[PDB]
RNA sequence: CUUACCUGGCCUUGACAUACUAGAAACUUUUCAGAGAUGGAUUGGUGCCUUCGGGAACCUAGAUACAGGUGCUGCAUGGCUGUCGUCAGCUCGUGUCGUGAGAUGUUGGGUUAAGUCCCGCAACGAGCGCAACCCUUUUCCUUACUUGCCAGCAUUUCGGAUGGGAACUUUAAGGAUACUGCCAGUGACAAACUGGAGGAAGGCGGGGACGACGUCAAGUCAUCAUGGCCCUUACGGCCAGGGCUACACACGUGCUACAAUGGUCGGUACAAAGGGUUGCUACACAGCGAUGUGAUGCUAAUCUCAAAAAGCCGAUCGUAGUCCGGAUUGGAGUCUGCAACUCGACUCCAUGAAGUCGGAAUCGCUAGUAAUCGCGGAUCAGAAUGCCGCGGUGAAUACGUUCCCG
């Protein structure tokens, strides 16, 4: 991937982490049933007024080594090319060629 | 469609503009990129220039279009035949 | 094959009459692995022929199969014993398919009775193969 | 009194043979109650019918895994093994009938690049 | 009514067996009753990794990773039992969880 | 055709993993990424220390890195200051206290990575590739291997058309899973681009299997 | 978002690195304008070491070497991959023959899935290939007895529920067994080959992984690395909206059907494998339903996804474009998400298209296979008829090598 795309991803994670608490608070206030309808409406308005990059749905998993956005394999944190290389070198504990 | 328990969605910047115009009575078009905003009853009688990707198409809001998204009146693809 | 001779696959006798002929007929009737439906179809015919005219269910089926059995291929060649039964079963299934009744079992029994008396698309087809054999 | 274990297509049956009038229970159920189709009922009764001792013994059978056919085969295998345990002299007859052999056939795994164990995607040279 | 429950998790069944044998031997030496080790079902995870860098969908490596689990029960634990178990070394690649 | 990785195919048969730790799915990824960073950092730092194998373990809330080297003195330092600096750097990278251990290789010519590094250094210093290959093969066979194969690929000597040259002495039974085959790959960066070096060394058949290896 | 493309709005040593010069802790609150990128007012905090004259991060300002480039060359390359092809071949040393390139060995007779093995011979000797070693399945034994099991005993709300038991199933580590071992006939008096007993299994029991020397300037500069070329207020970087989803058409790979071996309704059985703490959810209430609320157990052989479906029993439909089929369209909703217009999935009511088994031609499959039925997972907020796996039911036919192909 390009350095610009990697830095974009990093900035998005930073924004999500910065706004994590207030987003959860507003969502809880929205879900509150004892709260007033005006209170829940205001909470919804503030949630919609939060910056876009605060939303976790805009994060994309990228390979931890190269930044590739396809074939991620959450468990290892690496895309398929680097995963194949590392597994066949033997630096991934417990992973072996599978046959049955 | 959006859940009824959440209400219709309108962008705040667009809603403030239409509210200011209606509190006043300015007739100049309101220029917006918010194709996703829902047309509200307050919108009726106003001209909104909705972005369609390259231009801003003017739409005059009539009563029959309340409940539509603004983008349904600004097509984004060009086609005339083969 | 090419170099080997494959041993014939022996099928078990049916668990009710211990008759490999009836088991093979059930296999010919059965579609996409539904053995129980084919069992119902065949056993309905076997029970219904017994009620309509009293003979042994196995013996009556064997006699009709022998009647529908051809003896010539196609350059003339005689059919080996296995293909006689193999071709009679297919003819009896295909022809019994097209007669109109409520259930498949009743159609099968009806054409079993019909072929026992010399009328049936099966033995028309047998006589057609006979004609073609006389042609050469 | 005597015990046998039968296996067929991931189905395992535990068979407890005794001396009795002919009672037969599968998973606290009658044979007719447990098996719907006739052939499954007949496969279970094959060994005692062959030995002509259908009324000589009492059976307590449990079974787990597989389907109806696999469970019937496992029950037959377990009954054969229990009879072998009861008397070693019956082994030639049961082996001649073919009840002693464990059917080792099993589902073949799906393979990479194929739709099934053997079935291949359609090919177009044109 | 004190019972010690030890759970061993590993990616290598030989390592987990060695650790379980060591624990059982130490507990037996300290004069305590031991039940086990009991082999719990193994977890198997499979992955399909494309081997070519660009386009060969039928060219993949199939990898697997296994999680082995063992359970050890100590009943009637003597005084020296707990101290000996804590003094026992922790081998890399085996996770040991102790519950009282 | 293409050949399977000789180490990867034996990773559970006669070969041990280079990482030995357990982690649940929540920290597996973080542990692996930090391990890879450690390997890269060590490979860069000890370039001239003749280092082939790095083994990473996480025994209990800590880390242990075993470095196999043919230059223990240069790795250790004059008075041991260098291993203390390495411990500081590795602790900083890994987030947990780390202990460095040194494994001295007494037979460098039977180690696949060291031979590949030597050949690549010769190629970068512009020694003729065939001479370098035959010298390496003869040195290993004198050291005592039962077989060695060396392969070089690229613009050999500066030619515009790239090609591949290999040379083998002894026995290299690649299809026997129980054979002890060390394998290594290395890059030589020349004015005309990249030349790849591959080395296989065979050191006899291992009997008893993984039980003998004590996995 | 991804995103690399388009329209428009913005930045210029830059979103990111090293080298230099100065000043500030870093950070934090409230807003205002703007589509946002951005820009401006406005709070608190001003911290950590200290040989303490300053330093550690961290931020801002200046400067120039530079950064940056999914821009070009896979016909400069590394690495990786496809293909012939799981084809049985491919080589080397000493000695002989030839002026020589070369030959011999490796050919010749049987046998095998195999250059697999046995015989002859100016040849005598070796390697990589084949096979085996590795994984899984079928029989048995030992160890292990919980969260799994329940044969015998006892109590039971008849629920392994409870005392209890270690038998059996299973779980999973280690072993045993199969070797033409025994008999008969042949082969050539060899390698081999055919039949029989015992045995769970008999001659390679089944499946997986493993792919020789080489070929196609095959594929990939857009995973990554890298020689060379090109851009540098732009071919770099930031943003909002649009596009990748277009539609007179043609082709490939699939799913669903055209029905009675079936459709619908009522009742009632039997799996395997895998997933679950930002998660899976018992149970209750509300709703026709997608779902909502309350609540419970579970970091899991413990709780849960979960209903297996085809199957069996009973009723009905009676060959009709139908009680087949389920496209399309109208009207209402739910959930994920800042946001379902372009352009999501699912639910309810209404609608009810083509389709009556498909030309020339052509594809897959030799057994638990084909056919058919359901279940799970990776990616993933949401979004599979694809891909990778799992079990259930369970066939037909192989006379033979005359021609089709390799
Ligand atoms: N788009 C643009 C791509 C441009 C391309 N990259 C140029 C390229 O690579 N040129 C090569 C190169 O100069 C060199 O090759 C290596 N390896 O350096 C040379 C050695 O022969 O061959 C040339 N290629 C050739 N092709 C030709 C062929 O077949 N006949 C006739 C003659 O024109 C031959 N020369």
Curated annotation (Swiss-Prot), chain A:
Similarity remark: Belongs to the universal ribosomal protein uS14 family.
GO terms, biological process: translation
InterPro entries: Ribosomal_uS14, Ribosomal_uS14_bac/plastid, Ribosomal_uS14_CS
One Pfam family of this chain: Ribosomal_S14
Gene3D superfamilies membership: 1.10.287.1480
Function as written in the Swiss-Prot or TrEMBL entry: Binds 16S rRNA, required for the assembly of 30S particles and may also be responsible for determining the conformation of the 16S rRNA at the A site.
GO molecular function annotations of the record: rRNA binding; structural constituent of ribosome
Record note on quaternary structure: Part of the 30S ribosomal subunit. Contacts proteins S3 and S10.
Cystine crosslinks: none
GO cellular component terms listed in the entry, alphabetical order: cytoplasm; small ribosomal subunit
Protein name: Small ribosomal subunit protein uS14
Keyword vocabulary terms for this entry: Ribonucleoprotein, Ribosomal protein, RNA-binding, rRNA-binding
SUPFAM superfamilies the UniProt entry points to: Glucocorticoid receptor-like (DNA-binding domain)
Swiss-Prot record, chain B:
UniProt record, GO biological process: ribosomal small subunit assembly; translation
Keyword Ribosomal protein in record: yes
GO CC terms, sorted: cytoplasm; small ribosomal subunit
Domain of life per record: Bacteria
A Pfam family annotated for this UniProt entry: Ribosomal_S19
Function: Protein S19 forms a complex with S13 that binds strongly to the 16S ribosomal RNA.
HAMAP family referenced in this protein's UniProt entry, alphabetically: Ribosomal_uS19
Protein name as catalogued: Small ribosomal subunit protein uS19
Organism this protein belongs to: Acinetobacter baumannii (strain AB0057)
Lineage: Bacteria, Pseudomonadati, Pseudomonadota, Gammaproteobacteria, Moraxellales
Name of encoding gene: rpsS
UniProtKB/Swiss-Prot annotation, chain C:
Pfam families xref list: Ribosomal_S7 (PF00177)
GO cellular component, one term: small ribosomal subunit
Molecular function terms, GO-annotated: rRNA binding; structural constituent of ribosome; tRNA binding
PANTHER family: RIBOSOMAL PROTEIN S7
Function: One of the primary rRNA binding proteins, it binds directly to 16S rRNA where it nucleates assembly of the head domain of the 30S subunit. Is located at the subunit interface close to the decoding center, probably blocks exit of the E-site tRNA.
Keywords per UniProt: Ribonucleoprotein, Ribosomal protein, RNA-binding, rRNA-binding, tRNA-binding
CDD domains hit by this protein: uS7_Bacteria
InterPro entries in UniProt: Ribosomal_uS7, Ribosomal_uS7_bac/org-type, Ribosomal_uS7_CS, Ribosomal_uS7_dom, Ribosomal_uS7_dom_sf
Protein name: Small ribosomal subunit protein uS7
Protein family membership: Belongs to the universal ribosomal protein uS7 family.
The organism of origin for this protein: Acinetobacter baumannii (strain AB0057)
Subunit structure: Part of the 30S ribosomal subunit. Contacts proteins S9 and S11.
Gene3D superfamilies referenced in this protein's UniProt entry, alphabetically: Ribosomal protein S7 domain (1.10.455.10)
Any one of the GO BP annotations: translation
């Amino acid at each position: 991937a390009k350095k610009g795309m990697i830095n974009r991803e990093l900035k998005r994670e930073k924004t999500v982490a910065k706004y994590a608490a207030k987003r959860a608070e507003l969502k809880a206030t929205i879900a509150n049933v004892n709260a007033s309808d005006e209170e829940r409406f205001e909470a919804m308005l503030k949630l919609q007024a939060l910056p876009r990059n605060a939303s976790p749905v805009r994060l994309r998993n990228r390979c931890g080594l190269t930044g590739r956005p396809h074939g991620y394999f959450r468990k290892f944190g690496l895309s398929r090319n680097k995963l194949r290389d590392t597994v066949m070198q033997g630096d991934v504990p417990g992973v072996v060629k599978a046959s049955w | 469609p959006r859940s009824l328990k959440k209400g219709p969605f309108v962008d705040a910047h667009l809603f403030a503009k239409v509210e200011a115009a209606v509190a006043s009575n300015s007739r100049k078009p309101i220029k917006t990129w918010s194709r996703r905003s829902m047309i509200l009853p307050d919108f009726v009688g106003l001209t909104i220039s909705v972005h369609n990707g390259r231009n801003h198409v003017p739409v005059i809001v009539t009563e029959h279009m309340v409940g539509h998204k603004l983008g349904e009146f600004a097509p984004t693809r060009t086609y005339r035949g083969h | 094959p090419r170099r080997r001779v494959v041993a014939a696959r022996e099928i078990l006798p049916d668990p009710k009459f211990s008759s490999q002929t009836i088991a093979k007929f059930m296999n010919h009737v059965m579609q996409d692995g539904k053995k129980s439906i084919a069992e119902s179809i065949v056993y309905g015919a076997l029970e219904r022929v017994q009620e309509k005219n009293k003979v042994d269910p196995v013996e009556f089926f064997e006699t009709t199969l022998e009647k529908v059995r051809p003896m010539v291929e196609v350059v003339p060649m005689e059919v080996r014993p296995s293909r006689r039964t193999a071709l009679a079963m297919r003819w009896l299934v295909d022809a019994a398919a097209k007669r109109s009744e409520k259930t498949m079992a009743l159609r099968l029994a009806g054409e079993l009775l019909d072929a026992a008396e010399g009328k049936g698309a099966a033995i028309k087809k047998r006589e057609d193969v006979h004609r073609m054999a006389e042609a050469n | 009194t005597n015990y046998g274990t039968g296996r067929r297509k991931t189905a395992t049956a535990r068979v407890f043979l005794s001396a009795g009038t002919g009672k037969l229970v599968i998973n606290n159920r009658t044979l007719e109650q447990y098996f719907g189709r006739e052939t499954a009922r007949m496969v279970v009764r094959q060994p005692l019918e062959l030995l002509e001792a259908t009324e000589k013994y009492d059976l307590y059978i449990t079974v787990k895994g597989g389907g109806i056919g696999g469970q019937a085969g496992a029950i037959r295998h377990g009954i054969t093994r229990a009879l072998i345990a009861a008397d070693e002299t019956l082994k030639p007859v049961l082996r001649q009938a073919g009840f002693v052999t464990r059917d080792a056939r099993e589902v073949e795994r799906k393979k990479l690049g194929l739709r099934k164990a053997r079935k291949r995607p359609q090919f177009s040279k044109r | 009514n004190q019972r010690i429950r030890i759970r061993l998790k590993s990616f290598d069944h030989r390592l987990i067996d060695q650790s379980a044998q060591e624990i059982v031997e130490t507990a037996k030496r300290t004069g305590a009753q031991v039940c086990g080790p009991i082999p719990m079902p193994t977890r198997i995870e499979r992955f399909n990794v494309l081997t070519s860098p660009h386009v060969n969908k039928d060219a993949r490596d199939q990898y697997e990773i296994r999680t082995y689990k063992r359970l050890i029960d100590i009943v009637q634990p003597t005084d020296k039992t707990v101290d000996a178990l804590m003094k026992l070394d922790l081998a890399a690649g085996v996770d040991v969880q102790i519950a009282l | 055709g293409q050949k399977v990785h000789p180490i990867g195919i034996r990773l559970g048969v006669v070969k041990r993993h280079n990482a030995n730790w357990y982690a649940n799915p929540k920290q597996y990824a973080e542990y692996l990424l930090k391990d890879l960073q450690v390997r890269e950092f060590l490979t860069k730092k000890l370039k001239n220390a003749m280092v082939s194998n790095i083994l990473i373990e996480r025994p209990s809330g800590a880390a242990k890195v075993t470095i196999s080297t043919a230059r223990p003195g240069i790795v250790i330092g004059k008075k041991g200051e260098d291993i203390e600096k390495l411990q500081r750097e590795l602790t900083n990278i890994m987030g947990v206290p780390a202990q460095v251990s040194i494994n001295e290789i007494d037979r460098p010519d039977l180690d696949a990575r060291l031979v590949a590094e030597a050949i690549a250094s010769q190629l970068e210093k512009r020694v003729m590739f065939r001479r370098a290959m035959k010298r390496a093969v003869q040195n290993t066979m004198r050291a005592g291997a039962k077989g060695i194969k060396v392969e070089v690929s690229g613009r050999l000597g500066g030619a515009e058309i790239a090609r591949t040259e290999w040379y083998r002495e002894g026995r290299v039974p690649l299809h026997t899973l129980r054979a002890d085959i060390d394998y290594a790959t290395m890059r030589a960066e020349t004015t005309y681009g990249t030349i790849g070096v591959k080395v296989w060394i065979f050191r006899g058949e291992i009997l008893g299997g993984m039980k003998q290896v004590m996995n």
